[PDB]
Design a binder for this molecule. Structure first.
Ligand SMILES: O=P(O)(O)O[C@H]1[C@H](OP(=O)(O)O)[C@H](OP(=O)(O)O)[C@H](OP(=O)(O)O)[C@@H](OP(=O)(O)O)[C@H]1OP(=O)(O)O
Lengths: 182, 230, 18, 162, 73, 176, 123, 35, 138, 56
RNA sequence: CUCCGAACGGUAAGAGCCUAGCAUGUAGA
RNA sequence: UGGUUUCUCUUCAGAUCGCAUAAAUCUUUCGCCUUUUACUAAAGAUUUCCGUGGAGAGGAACAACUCUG
RNA sequence: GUGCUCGCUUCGGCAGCACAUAUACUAAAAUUGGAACGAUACAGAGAAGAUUAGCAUCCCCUGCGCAAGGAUG
C-alpha cells in the first residue's frame, strides 16, 4: 500500500539523519520526528562552529519534511478526520504552508518563483470555487494545482541533489592577474 | 509480499539485527533519497478514491523504497475523476458549514511511525469523493469511472492492459463530457484569440508593449527603448 | 603462468565435484 | 592506484582440488600490508573449509614472496624470519600440509555452552588453543616482517634437538 | 506591537508579532504557530537566561526586533 | 553507566529501550542529583526500595528541565529492562499507590498492545489519590483512576509518547 | 472520605462509560449528519432554510497594510485549538511600517543591499 | 573508439582461468597440472 | 484484514474463510516476532514459510483437489492469498516443491548458479545438513 | 574540592566525585558497570515483602 | 493593497583535574 | 499469410518526439550591492533528470481464439 | 519430489526412465582498544614601537562547489 510505502521512506529518511550525526560524532543534537533540528544542551561556546551545516544537509531535511507531511496526512486519514476534507483541505494547506510556514528558504531562493506560482494557483481556484453560495468559507483546494508545482520541484532537484549531496556523503569515506603574462 | 515489514523493523539495533556490518551501507545507499521522494509524490492515492496498492523496488538492507510505477490515467478519465471530485467538494460546503479542519502537523516531534497499526486496521472510508452516479445517464461510465485500476488496466474493449493507447466508444465519451462540463470553459476558438493567444504574447515581449491584462510586463529584449529624437 | 580456457563452467564444476 | 588480475597464493591455500572458484572484488577490503585497497580474491578450499580471501596487498606481497592468505613463504613454507635466517629452507620445509590452515573458525556459542546452531553449525565446536603459548599471540607486521616472529623462533630452536 | 524574531539555530527562524502587555505564555503559542512544535516544550533563552512562564513582555523591555534564541525542552 | 544496564537482554518496540523517552528529556535527566545518586548502582531489589520511598507523579518542572523521581525511576527501570513477572509484580502490589503507578508507566511504554489493555483495566477501579508536580512546581491532587485513564487517553503524558496497535473499538472486533 | 471517594469514582467511571459509548456513537452521528445534510439539500427548501451560520474556529478579523507593510502570516500550524492569542487582527505597524512611505522621494522597499525582487504590486 | 569509450565509462563511473602452480607444486595436492 | 476490493466475492470463499484466516493470523504473529534468536536472516524464514503454506493451500484446492471455482481462484490471487509467480513455477514438472522464488533467481548467486534448495539429496554430497539462507529450507 | 579515596584524586563537582570513585581505572574490579538483574519471583517479591514488613 | 529571505564575515586566547554516545570483526599454532 | 499480452537490451529520434515543462552550466545584459554563496529575468546554446516513439533478440500466460487478407 | 514404464507384475510395493546440480564478507558471536574545548576552581585580551607593500615558480579543516576562506616552505 502507499501508506506503508510512505512510512517506510520516512522511517528510512529519519534513519539517515540519525546516522549522519552519529558519523559526525556530535552527540548533543537531536533530529526531531518532524524532520527539524532541536538542540538539547543549548551549548554554544565553540560547538556551534561545528554544527553549522551547508546548503545540502538542510535542503535534504526540508525535502523529507515536506515528504512526511504528504505521508502523514494520509496516516491521519486512516485514523483521525477523514472523508470530507482530509486529503482535500489538508493538501490545500500543504500547497499553501510549504511557501508560507513549512519548508525552507535558506537552501535556494528560486523556490520562491515556484512558491509565487503555487500561490497564484491558489487564487486561480478560489475565485472559481467561491463564485456561488460558497463565498468566503475555506474549502477544498484540490491537490492538482499545488501538487503539480512541487512534483516538478523534486523533478528538478533529483538531478540536482545527487550532485549537491553526492560529495557530502562521499567525504565520510573518501576523505576530501597580469603577472602570468609577464 | 510482507517481506518489507520485517527488514525495516530492525532499524537501530546494537550490531545484532541488520546493524553489524550493514549500517555503513544503510546510510550510503539511502543517499539516493530524493529520487524516491519524487516517486512518492508521483504515485498519489488520487483522493477521488481510497488507498490503492503500488509496486515497490526496495533494498535488502532496507535503505530505499522506490515506487516504480508511473501514473498513466486516461486523459478523459482523469478529467472527470477530478471533475466529479470538484462538484462533491463544492456541494459539501453548500450542505455543511462547520470547517472541521485538521492540525497541519498530525503528530508531535517525538512519535515513531509504527506502520503495523495502519497495515491491517480493517477501516477505510471508501465514500470519500465518489459521487453517486445514477444508473440512468451514467450507464456506460458506471464501473469504469470509480477506481484507478480499471483506469489503466480495464481489459474490457481492450485498451493496452499495462496503460497503453486506449480506445473508447462514442457514448462513452459523450457521458464523459457531461461531467467535465461543470469544470471547463470551452466555447469557441475566438475568445482568447486577439489578446490571449500564445502567439500574441510574442508581440507583447518583442515590442516591449504590454497587453492590458495578458502578460506580467516582461522587460524589453534590446536596450534602446524610446527617446531617439524629440 | 596464467592460461585461461574456453570450456564451460557448468560441466567443469559438475565433473570435478562428482 | 592499486589493481590486480590474479592472486599470488600458495598451493596449500589454493585448495585440495584441481578445480576451484574465485571471486574478485576490485579495490576493496583495505589490505593492511600496504594500507591500500587490493583485489580481494575469495575462494573455497573444499568441503568443510574456511572459505577465506586475500588479506595482504598485491605489490606488498611481491617483495616478500609469500602466500596471499597463509603469508609464510613461496616454496619451503617457513616464515619470513626463518627464511631470512639462512639448504636451510630444504630441511625446515614440510610437504602435505595440514588442514588447520584451511580449517574454519571456532564457535563462540559452543565455547559459551549455548550452541543453538546444532549439527548445521559451520564453525568448529572444538576446544580452542592454549593462550600461554606464543604461537597464538602474533600480529600483522609480526608475521610479515621478521621482527618478533614466534613461529620462526621455535623453528630454529627445534631444528637442533637431537 | 513588537515583532519578536525567534531565530534559533539550524534554519528555524520565524517572526512572532505580539502585544507589549502580552504575557510570555501567549508568545510561546504564537512562536509554536510558526515553528511547528508543542508550545509547552519550548524554552526561550538569552545567554543561559531561561525565561519564565508568567512574566509579561513589557517587563523584559523586549522592543521591536529584539530576537530570541529558541530552544526545545 | 548510562548506555544500557543490560548488555543483550531484550529490545523496545521500535528502538533501544533507553531511547524511549524524548532525547531532550533524556539528556537533562541523565545529569541530575537524584539520577547520579541512583545510576551508580541499581538492581531489581534496589528498584523496589527507591520507588517505595518516593511519593510523586510527574515529569519536568521549572525553567531548566528538572525531572521528577517518578520519571527518573522510569528511565532506570527501562534501562534495566526487567522481566514481565517483575513488572506484573509492581503493578499488582498494594504496598504503595506510587508503586502501582510506576509499574503502569513501564507497562504502557514497553509492553504489548494486548498486555497494556489487560493490565491497565483493573487499575481503573482504584479511587485513591496522589500528588502530582505541575509545570510551576506546585503540587496537584490527582486520583489513581484519573492517572490510569490518562495513560489510555491520547499521548499527552509527562515525556511519554507510545501509541497502541489499535484503539479500544478496533481491538474489540478482533478480541475481547 | 471513603464514601465520597466511591461516589466520585462512580461519577468518573459513568462518564468514562458515557465517553466510550459516545465514541462509537460518533461514527453513527457522522453518518447521520451526512444523511441529514443530503436530505436538506434535496427536498427541504429551495434557498429558504439554512439553519446554520459561519462557525469558524479562528477569527478572520483583518485590516489593511498602509503602504508597504510586510505580509505577516499567522502560520498554518495550530488552527483547531481556537486560543485567544490568535484573534488579534495582525495589521499593525511592527518595526518599519510606522512611516507613511509617501513623503519619501521615489521608493524605499529594503535598504539592506538585497533587493532581488523588483515589484510594487499594481500591474 | 572502443578504447576511448572504455576510458570514458571508467571516468564516468569514478567521477575460466587456469594458472599452472610452478611455484611449489611437486607433491602437495599432486595431480594439479592446470589448477 | 481488509479485502481491499469490496466487490462481493463469490461462492466458495466462505468454505475457505477460516482456513485462510488461520494462515493469515500465523503470518501476522510471525511478523510481530522480535529479532532475538534469529542470527541474520533467520527472522525472514517464517515469513516465507507461512507464504509457502498459503500458496500450497490455494494450489491444492485448484489443481490437486479442484474443488474451488475459477472465479474464486482469480479473486484469491488478486486479493493476495497466493502469489501468481509461485503458482506459475509449480506448474512446471521441473519444480513442484520449491522452497522460495528468490532461490530460483539465476542472478542472485555471486557464482551465477542456483541454491541448495533446488538440489536433490541423492545428487548432493554425503555429509551436508545445510539449509538455504535466502530461501529458508531445502 | 572533594577527595577520592580509592582513585586518590580531588574533583570539584558532585557527580564527578561520585564518578571518580565508581567508573575509573581503580573501579574496574570494584563494582563495575556491568550489573545483573535478580530473580523476578524470588528476589523481587521478597524485597516487596521486606519493605512492607519494615514499614509496618 | 498582502513580495514573507538564510548562512559566512561572531562569541576567542590557556594552565591542572574529571567523566563519556563512538569503531575494527582477520592470516597464524 | 497464422500470437493478444508482459518484462529484460540495441539504435536513430528533428513529429506540439512533451496538446505540459524542472534544475544546473557557459557567453552577453539589468537591478541591488558590503566579502561570498543563496539572488531578479531578457537573449542564445550545452548537459542531467521526469518521460515517450518504430525495429530486429530472449522468457511467461489458452496460443490457439483462428485476427486481417 | 513430480509424471511415465505393454518392467517385476502385485495393484501393498520394488527397479528403471524424464526434469530439478552446488545459496552462504558464513553466527544468535568472542574480544580488542577511547575521542566533547564539555562543566567545575585558578589569572584575565595588555594601562607602550623606527623597514614602505604583492604576484607564481609544498598540505589539513568549513563548505555542495569548475565561488570562496584559515594555515602554510
Ligand atoms: O493569504 P491570502 O493570499 O491573503 O489568502 C487568505 C487566506 O490565506 P491564509 O490566511 O494564509 O490562510 C485563505 O485561506 P486558506 O485557503 O489559505 O486557508 C483565504 O481565506 P479563507 O480561509 O478561505 O476565508 C483567502 O481568501 P478569502 O476566502 O476571500 O478570505 C484569504 O485572502 P484574504 O486575506 O485577502 O481575504
Amino acid at each position: 500500500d502507499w501508506v506503508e510505502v510512505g512510512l517506510q521512506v520516512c522511517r528510512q529518511g529519519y534513519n539517515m539523519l540519525n546516522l549522519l550525526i552519529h558519523r559526525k560524532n556530535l552527540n548533543y543534537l537531536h533530529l526531531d520526528y518532524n524532520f527539524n533540528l532541536k538542540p538539547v544542551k543549548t551549548l554554544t561556546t565553540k560547538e556551534r562552529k561545528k554544527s553549522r551545516f551547508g546548503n545540502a544537509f538542510h535542503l535534504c531535511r526540508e525535502v523529507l519534511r515536506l515528504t512526511k507531511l504528504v505521508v502523514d496526512s494520509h496516516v491521519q486519514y486512516r485514523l483521525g478526520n477523514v472523508d470530507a476534507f482530509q486529503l482535500a483541505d489538508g493538501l490545500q494547506y500543504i500547497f499553501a504552508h510549504v511557501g508560507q510556514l513549512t519548508g525552507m528558504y535558506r537552501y535556494k531562493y528560486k523556490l520562491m518563483r515556484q512558491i509565487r506560482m503555487c500561490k497564484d494557483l491558489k487564487h486561480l481556484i478560489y475565485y472559481r470555487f467561491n463564485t456561488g453560495p460558497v463565498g468566503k468559507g475555506p474549502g477544498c483546494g484540490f491537490w492538482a494545482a499545488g501538487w503539480r508545482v512541487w512534483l516538478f520541484f523534486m523533478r528538478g532537484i533529483t538531478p540536482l541533489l545527487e550532485r549537491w549531496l553526492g560529495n557530502l556523503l562521499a567525504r565520510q569515506f573518501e576523505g576530501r592577474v597580469e603577472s602570468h603574462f609577464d | 509480499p510482507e517481506h518489507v515489514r520485517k527488514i525495516i523493523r530492525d532499524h537501530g539495533d546494537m550490531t545484532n539485527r541488520k546493524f553489524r556490518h550493514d549500517k555503513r551501507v544503510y546510510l550510503g545507499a539511502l543517499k539516493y533519497m530524493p529520487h524516491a521522494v519524487l516517486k512518492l509524490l508521483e504515485n498519489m492515492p488520487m483522493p477521488w478514491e481510497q488507498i490503492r496498492d503500488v509496486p515497490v523496488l526496495y533494498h535488502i538492507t532496507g535503505a530505499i523504497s522506490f515506487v516504480n510505477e508511473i501514473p498513466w490515467v486516461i486523459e478523459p478519465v482523469y478529467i472527470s475523476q477530478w471533475g466529479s471530485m470538484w462538484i462533491m467538494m463544492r456541494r459539501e460546503k453548500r450542505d455543511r458549514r462547520h470547517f472541521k479542519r485538521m492540525r497541519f502537523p498530525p503528530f508531535d516531534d517525538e512519535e515513531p511511525p509504527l506502520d503495523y497499526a495502519d497495515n491491517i486496521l480493517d477501516v477505510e472510508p471508501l465514500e470519500a469523493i465518489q459521487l453517486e452516479l445514477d444508473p440512468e445517464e451514467d450507464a456506460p461510465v458506471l464501473d469504469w469511472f470509480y477506481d484507478h485500476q480499471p483506469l489503466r488496466d480495464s481489459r474490457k474493449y481492450v485498451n493496452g492492459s499495462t496503460y497503453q493507447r486506449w480506445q473508447f466508444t462514442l457514448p462513452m465519451m459523450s457521458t464523459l463530457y457531461r461531467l467535465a462540463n461543470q469544470l471547463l470553459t470551452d466555447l469557441v476558438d475566438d475568445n482568447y484569440f486577439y489578446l490571449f493567444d500564445l502567439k500574441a504574447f510574442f508581440t507583447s515581449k518583442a515590442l516591449n508593449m504590454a497587453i492590458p491584462g495578458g502578460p506580467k510586463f516582461e522587460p524589453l529584449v534590446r536596450d534602446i527603448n524610446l527617446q531617439d529624437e524629440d | 603462468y596464467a592460461e585461461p580456457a574456453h570450456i564451460n563452467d557448468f560441466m567443469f564444476e559438475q565433473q570435478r565435484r562428482t | 592506484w592499486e589493481d590486480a588480475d590474479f592472486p599470488i597464493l600458495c598451493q596449500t591455500c589454493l585448495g585440495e582440488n584441481p578445480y576451484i572458484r574465485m571471486t574478485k572484488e576490485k579495490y576493496g577490503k583495505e589490505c593492511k600490508i600496504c594500507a591500500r585497497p587490493f583485489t580481494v580474491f575469495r575462494w573455497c578450499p573444499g568441503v568443510r573449509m574456511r572459505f577465506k580471501k586475500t588479506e595482504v596487498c598485491q605489490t606488498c606481497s611481491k617483495l616478500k614472496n609469500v602466500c596471499q592468505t597463509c603469508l609464510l613463504d613461496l616454496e619451503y613454507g617457513l616464515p619470513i624470519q626463518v627464511r631470512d635466517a639462512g639448504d636451510m629452507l630444504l630441511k625446515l620445509a614440510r610437504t602435505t600440509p595440514y588442514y588447520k590452515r584451511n580449517r574454519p573458525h571456532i564457535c563462540s556459542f559452543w565455547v559459551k555452552g549455548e550452541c543453538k546452531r546444532g549439527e548445521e553449525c559451520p564453525y568448529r565446536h572444538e576446544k580452542p588453543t592454549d593462550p600461554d603459548d606464543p604461537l597464538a599471540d602474533q600480529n600483522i607486521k609480526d608475521r610479515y616482517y621478521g621482527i618478533n616472529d614466534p613461529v620462526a623462533d621455535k623453528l630454529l630452536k627445534r631444528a637442533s634437538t637431537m | 506591537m513588537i515583532e519578536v524574531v525567534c531565530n534559533d539555530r539550524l534554519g528555524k527562524k520565524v517572526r512572532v508579532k505580539c502585544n507589549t502587555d502580552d504575557t510570555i505564555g501567549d508568545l510561546k503559542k504564537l512562536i509554536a504557530a510558526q515553528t511547528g512544535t508543542r508550545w509547552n516544550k519550548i524554552v526561550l533563552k538569552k545567554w543561559y537566561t531561561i525565561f519564565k512562564d508568567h512574566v509579561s513582555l513589557g517587563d523584559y523591555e523586549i522592543h521591536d526586533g529584539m530576537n530570541l534564541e529558541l530552544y526545545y525542552q | 553507566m548510562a548506555n544500557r544496564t543490560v548488555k543483550d537482554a531484550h529490545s523496545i518496540h521500535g528502538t533501544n529501550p533507553q531511547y524511549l523517552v524524548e532525547k531532550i528529556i533524556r539528556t537533562r535527566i541523565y545529569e541530575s542529583k537524584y539520577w547520579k545518586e541512583e545510576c551508580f548502582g541499581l538492581t531489581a531489589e534496589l528498584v523496589v526500595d527507591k520507588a517505595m520511598e518516593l511519593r510523586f507523579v510527574g515529569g519536568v518542572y521549572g525553567g531548566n528541565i528538572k525531572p521528577t523521581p517518578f520519571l527518573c525511576l522510569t528511565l532506570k527501570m527501562l534501562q534495566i529492562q526487567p522481566e514481565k513477572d517483575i513488572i506484573v509484580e509492581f503493578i499488582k502490589n498494594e504496598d504503595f499507590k506510587y508503586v502501582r503507578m510506576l509499574g503502569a508507566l513501564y507497562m504502557r511504554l514497553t509492553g504489548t498492545a494486548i498486555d497494556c489493555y489487560k493490565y491497565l483495566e483493573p487499575l481503573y477501579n482504584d479511587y485513591r489519590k496522589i500528588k502530582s508536580q505541575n509545570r510551576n512546581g506546585e503540587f496537584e491532587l490527582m486520583h489513581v483512576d484519573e492517572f490510569i485513564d490518562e495513560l489510555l487517553h491520547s499521548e499527552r503524558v509527562c515525556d511519554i509518547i507510545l501509541p497502541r496497535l489499535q484503539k479500544r473499538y478496533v481491538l474489540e472486533e478482533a478480541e475481547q | 472520605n471513603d464514601e465520597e471517594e466511591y461516589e466520585a469514582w462512580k461519577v468518573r467511571e459513568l462518564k468514562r462509560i458515557k465517553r466510550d459509548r459516545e465514541d462509537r456513537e460518533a461514527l453513527e452521528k457522522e453518518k447521520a449528519e451526512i444523511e441529514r445534510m443530503r436530505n436538506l439539500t434535496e427536498e427541504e427548501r429551495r434557498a429558504e432554510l439554512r439553519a446554520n451560520g459561519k462557525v469558524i474556529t479562528n477569527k478572520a478579523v483583518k485590516g489593511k497594510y498602509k503602504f508597504l507593510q510586510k505580509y505577516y502570516h499567522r502560520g498554518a500550524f495550530f488552527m483547531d485549538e481556537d486560543e485567544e492569542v490568535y484573534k488579534r487582527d495582525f495589521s499593525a505597524p511592527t518595526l518599519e511600517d510606522h512611516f507613511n512611505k509617501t513623503i519619501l522621494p521615489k521608493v524605499m522597499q529594503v535598504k539592506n543591499f538585497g533587493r532581488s525582487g523588483r515589484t510594487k504590486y499594481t500591474h | 573508439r572502443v578504447a576511448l569509450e572504455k576510458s570514458v565509462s571508467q571516468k564516468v563511473a569514478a567521477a575460466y582461468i587456469r594458472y599452472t602452480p610452478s611455484q611449489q607444486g611437486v607433491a602437495f595436492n599432486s595431480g594439479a597440472k592446470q589448477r | 484484514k481488509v479485502k481491499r476490493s469490496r466487490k462481493a466475492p463469490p461462492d466458495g470463499w466462505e468454505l475457505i474463510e477460516p482456513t485462510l484466516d488461520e494462515l493469515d493470523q500465523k503470518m501476522r504473529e510471525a511478523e510481530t516476532e522480535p529479532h532475538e534468536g534469529k542470527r541474520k536472516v533467520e527472522s525472514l524464514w517464517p515469513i516465507f514459510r507461512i507464504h509457502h503454506q498459503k500458496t500450497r493451500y490455494i494450489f491444492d484446492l485448484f489443481y490437486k483437489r479442484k474443488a474451488i471455482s475459477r472465479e474464486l481462484y482469480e479473486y484469491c490471487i488478486k486479493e493476495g492469498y497466493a502469489d501468481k509467480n509461485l503458482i506459475a513455477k509449480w506448474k512446471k514438472q521441473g519444480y513442484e516443491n520449491l522452497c522460495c522464488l528468490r532461490c530460483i533467481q539465476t542472478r542472485d548467486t555471486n557464482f551465477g548458479t542456483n541454491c541448495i534448495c533446488r538440489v536433490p539429496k541423492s545428487k548432493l554430497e554425503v555429509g551436508r545438513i545445510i539449509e538455504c539462507t535466502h530461501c529458508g529450507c531445502r | 574540592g572533594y577527595y577520592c579515596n580509592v582513585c586518590d584524586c580531588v574533583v570539584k563537582d558532585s557527580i564527578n566525585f561520585l564518578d571518580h570513585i565508581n567508573g575509573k581505572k581503580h573501579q574496574r574490579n570494584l563494582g563495575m558497570s556491568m550489573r545483573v538483574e535478580r530473580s523476578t519471583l524470588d528476589q523481587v517479591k521478597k524485597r516487596f515483602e521486606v519493605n512492607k514488613k519494615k514499614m509496618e
